[PDB]
Design a protein around this ligand. Structure first.
Ligand SMILES: *C/C=C(C)/C=C/C=C(C)/C=C/C1=C(C)CCCC1(C)C
Length: 137
């Protein structure tokens, strides 16, 4: 359905704990938590092809993928990874990531459109799950 839209964050939970698992030191975690509270997500969806632009005050990144086809992006802490997205249901998809180089926590993400019109993003590193909730602009 309708992932397409301009989304603004209303809630961000456990993001600091996620970055801590990923090795980010305390001062940068605090500043990253602050940046995340200004997160905006623009999505264009055509069938199972997605164009996604995630931005904060000073940074913007574009994620392009097709469900079921491997692509390359970065982990939350900025390491290059190979990613693969699959549907889990009508309006939820799940992305598994694999580091291109080296070792690290096992990371993934999910994107879900709820019946109440919220977009829920989850980001995971090992046992720690960050949940972010967005509404349409
Ligand atoms: C479908 C939506 C997706 C896959 C959103 C991904 C979002 C990110 C990779 C956000 C990353 C951020 C940081 C790594 C620190 C700066 C603040 C964020 C939350 C924009």
């Amino acid at each position: 359905p309708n992932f397409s839209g301009n989304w603004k964050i209303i809630r961000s939970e456990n993001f600091e704990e996620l970055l801590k698992v990923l090795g980010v030191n305390v001062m940068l975690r605090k500043i990253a938590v602050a940046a995340a509270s200004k997160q905006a997500v623009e999505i264009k969806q055509e069938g199972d092809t997605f164009y996604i632009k995630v931005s904060t005050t000073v940074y913007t990144t574009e994620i392009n993928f097709k469900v079921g086809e491997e692509f390359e992006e970065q982990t939350v802490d900025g390491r290059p990874c190979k990613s693969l997205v699959k549907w889990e249901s009508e309006n939820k998809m799940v992305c598994e990531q694999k580091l291109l180089k080296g070792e690290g926590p096992k990371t993934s993400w999910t994107k879900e459109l709820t019946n109440d019109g919220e977009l829920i993003l989850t980001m995971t590193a090992d046992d720690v799950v960050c949940t972010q909730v967005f509404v349409r602009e």
